[PDB]
Design a protein around this motif. Structure first.
Motif, PDB file in Angstrom:
ATOM      1  N   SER C   9       0.779  -1.212   0.000  1.00  0.00           N
ATOM      2  CA  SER C   9       0.000   0.000   0.000  1.00  0.00           C
ATOM      3  C   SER C   9       0.819   1.274   0.000  1.00  0.00           C
ATOM      4  O   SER C   9       0.378   2.276  -0.502  1.00  0.00           O
ATOM      5  CB  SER C   9      -1.018   0.011   1.149  1.00  0.00           C
ATOM      6  OG  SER C   9      -0.381   0.131   2.391  1.00  0.00           O
ATOM      7  N   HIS C  10       2.023   1.244   0.557  1.00  0.00           N
ATOM      8  CA  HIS C  10       2.874   2.414   0.547  1.00  0.00           C
ATOM      9  C   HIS C  10       3.369   2.695  -0.853  1.00  0.00           C
ATOM     10  O   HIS C  10       3.532   3.849  -1.226  1.00  0.00           O
ATOM     11  CB  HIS C  10       4.028   2.214   1.520  1.00  0.00           C
ATOM     12  CG  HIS C  10       3.557   2.148   2.940  1.00  0.00           C
ATOM     13  ND1 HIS C  10       2.877   3.187   3.550  1.00  0.00           N
ATOM     14  CD2 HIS C  10       3.668   1.174   3.869  1.00  0.00           C
ATOM     15  CE1 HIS C  10       2.609   2.845   4.806  1.00  0.00           C
ATOM     16  NE2 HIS C  10       3.082   1.631   5.023  1.00  0.00           N
ATOM     17  N   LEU C  11       3.585   1.657  -1.639  1.00  0.00           N
ATOM     18  CA  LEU C  11       4.020   1.829  -3.031  1.00  0.00           C
ATOM     19  C   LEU C  11       2.865   2.450  -3.850  1.00  0.00           C
ATOM     20  O   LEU C  11       3.055   3.365  -4.630  1.00  0.00           O
ATOM     21  CB  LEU C  11       4.474   0.473  -3.604  1.00  0.00           C
ATOM     22  CG  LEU C  11       4.863   0.388  -5.079  1.00  0.00           C
ATOM     23  CD1 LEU C  11       5.891   1.469  -5.425  1.00  0.00           C
ATOM     24  CD2 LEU C  11       5.431  -0.968  -5.353  1.00  0.00           C
TER      25      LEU C  11
ATOM     26  N   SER G   9       6.158   7.163   7.338  1.00  0.00           N
ATOM     27  CA  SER G   9       4.840   7.740   7.277  1.00  0.00           C
ATOM     28  C   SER G   9       3.971   7.454   8.484  1.00  0.00           C
ATOM     29  O   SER G   9       3.117   8.237   8.814  1.00  0.00           O
ATOM     30  CB  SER G   9       4.115   7.342   5.983  1.00  0.00           C
ATOM     31  OG  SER G   9       3.786   5.981   5.983  1.00  0.00           O
ATOM     32  N   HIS G  10       4.188   6.333   9.160  1.00  0.00           N
ATOM     33  CA  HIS G  10       3.425   6.025  10.350  1.00  0.00           C
ATOM     34  C   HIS G  10       3.812   6.951  11.479  1.00  0.00           C
ATOM     35  O   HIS G  10       2.970   7.317  12.289  1.00  0.00           O
ATOM     36  CB  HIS G  10       3.635   4.564  10.728  1.00  0.00           C
ATOM     37  CG  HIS G  10       3.058   3.635   9.704  1.00  0.00           C
ATOM     38  ND1 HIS G  10       1.715   3.631   9.372  1.00  0.00           N
ATOM     39  CD2 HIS G  10       3.638   2.681   8.942  1.00  0.00           C
ATOM     40  CE1 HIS G  10       1.503   2.692   8.455  1.00  0.00           C
ATOM     41  NE2 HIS G  10       2.653   2.101   8.182  1.00  0.00           N
ATOM     42  N   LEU G  11       5.067   7.354  11.529  1.00  0.00           N
ATOM     43  CA  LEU G  11       5.529   8.293  12.560  1.00  0.00           C
ATOM     44  C   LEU G  11       4.895   9.680  12.304  1.00  0.00           C
ATOM     45  O   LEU G  11       4.411  10.339  13.206  1.00  0.00           O
ATOM     46  CB  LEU G  11       7.069   8.351  12.558  1.00  0.00           C
ATOM     47  CG  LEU G  11       7.772   9.351  13.474  1.00  0.00           C
ATOM     48  CD1 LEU G  11       7.258   9.214  14.910  1.00  0.00           C
ATOM     49  CD2 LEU G  11       9.244   9.098  13.429  1.00  0.00           C
TER      50      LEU G  11
ATOM     51  N   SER I   9      -2.062  -0.798  12.028  1.00  0.00           N
ATOM     52  CA  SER I   9      -2.968   0.044  11.290  1.00  0.00           C
ATOM     53  C   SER I   9      -3.403  -0.520   9.954  1.00  0.00           C
ATOM     54  O   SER I   9      -4.478  -0.229   9.496  1.00  0.00           O
ATOM     55  CB  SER I   9      -2.403   1.461  11.121  1.00  0.00           C
ATOM     56  OG  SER I   9      -1.303   1.470  10.255  1.00  0.00           O
ATOM     57  N   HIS I  10      -2.573  -1.339   9.320  1.00  0.00           N
ATOM     58  CA  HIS I  10      -2.949  -1.950   8.064  1.00  0.00           C
ATOM     59  C   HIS I  10      -4.032  -2.980   8.280  1.00  0.00           C
ATOM     60  O   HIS I  10      -4.900  -3.147   7.432  1.00  0.00           O
ATOM     61  CB  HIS I  10      -1.719  -2.560   7.404  1.00  0.00           C
ATOM     62  CG  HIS I  10      -0.729  -1.514   6.992  1.00  0.00           C
ATOM     63  ND1 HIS I  10      -1.036  -0.509   6.094  1.00  0.00           N
ATOM     64  CD2 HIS I  10       0.559  -1.319   7.351  1.00  0.00           C
ATOM     65  CE1 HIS I  10       0.041   0.249   5.914  1.00  0.00           C
ATOM     66  NE2 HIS I  10       1.021  -0.225   6.663  1.00  0.00           N
ATOM     67  N   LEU I  11      -4.009  -3.654   9.414  1.00  0.00           N
ATOM     68  CA  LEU I  11      -5.047  -4.643   9.738  1.00  0.00           C
ATOM     69  C   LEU I  11      -6.386  -3.910   9.981  1.00  0.00           C
ATOM     70  O   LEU I  11      -7.431  -4.312   9.502  1.00  0.00           O
ATOM     71  CB  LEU I  11      -4.610  -5.472  10.961  1.00  0.00           C
ATOM     72  CG  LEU I  11      -5.586  -6.488  11.550  1.00  0.00           C
ATOM     73  CD1 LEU I  11      -6.119  -7.417  10.455  1.00  0.00           C
ATOM     74  CD2 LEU I  11      -4.881  -7.285  12.601  1.00  0.00           C
TER      75      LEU I  11
HETATM   76 ZN    ZN Z   1       2.813   0.677   6.772  1.00  0.00          ZN
END
Ligand code: ZN
Ligand code: CL
Ligand code: CL
Ligand code: CL
Ligand code: CL
Ligand code: CL
Ligand code: CL
Ligand code: CL
Ligand code: CL
Ligand code: ZN
Ligand code: ZN
Ligand code: ZN
Ligand code: ZN
Ligand code: ZN
Ligand code: ZN
Ligand code: ZN
Ligand code: ZN
Ligand code: ZN
Ligand code: ZN
Lengths: 21, 29, 30, 21, 29, 21, 30, 21, 30, 21, 29, 21
Positions: C9-11, G9-11, I9-11
């Protein structure tokens, strides 16, 4: 397209699947 | 009226999950 | 621009940003 | 493909742009 | 009218990618 | 600021770069 | 609040949430 | 810096708040 | 649908998508 | 729980749906 | 008027961070 | 519920915490 269908209304998983390869 | 830019960002994440290894084309216009 | 590994998903998010109105294709099995 | 180039290896901005339509 | 809170969340993710190792300040107000 | 410029209109990568350090 | 490693990005998302109207700075090379 | 404190190590909520303006 | 490990968070995002109007519960300590 | 099933192991779509209300 | 679908997506990510190991129920309706 | 409270207005961390288990 996907923006016209799935931005105005929420598309279910099944409707989203149309856009997959 | 929905924000197309924010909607699209969301949509491609949903397609990532739904499509899996099949992948997808994202063609907004 | 970041110089790092981008997966999943980051890509896809990175492509969404980079490609703009052009859109993109995400083909992981290619 | 994109996984080999950008996920297991690193893509420059120019390389990410190769996947735009 | 754009939702500022949702827009900002999106913007900081975009700045993460665009700015890379340079970083950024996020000053909404 | 960034909210005034980039929330009402979509900022390109180049416009976003202004906000980097 | 979570007690876990936060990177990239999570940070940044965590800072956005925690800092609110104050905003924040993300300086990874410091 | 934030990477050393919160990414390679763990930041409490109070420590994350040190990076707010 | 993806067949991969989903954490944090992805879950949660995956549950949000899959569950729709039904909602869901995320209980990591169970 | 969900972590054991879907994070340290892999959940099918049907298994993710077990966590819906 | 806020987009409920996009708002909810955002909210559950915020609850992930705020709730931590306690978890949460997301009940939109 | 959470949608009624936290979509129209921005909920602080403290207000979000109400929805945790
Ligand atoms: Zn992630
Ligand atoms: Cl949004
Ligand atoms: Cl969606
Ligand atoms: Cl990740
Ligand atoms: Cl973007
Ligand atoms: Cl943007
Ligand atoms: Cl937030
Ligand atoms: Cl969704
Ligand atoms: Cl929030
Ligand atoms: Zn959003
Ligand atoms: Zn890496
Ligand atoms: Zn954007
Ligand atoms: Zn590497
Ligand atoms: Zn960790
Ligand atoms: Zn928020
Ligand atoms: Zn650790
Ligand atoms: Zn995995
Ligand atoms: Zn969605
Ligand atoms: Zn595995």
């Amino acid at each position: 397209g996907i923006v016209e269908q799935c931005c105005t209304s929420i598309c279910s998983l099944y409707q989203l699947e149309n856009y997959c390869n | 009226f929905v924000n197309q830019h924010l909607c699209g960002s969301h949509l491609v994440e949903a397609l990532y999950l739904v499509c899996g290894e099949r992948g997808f084309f994202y063609t907004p216009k």
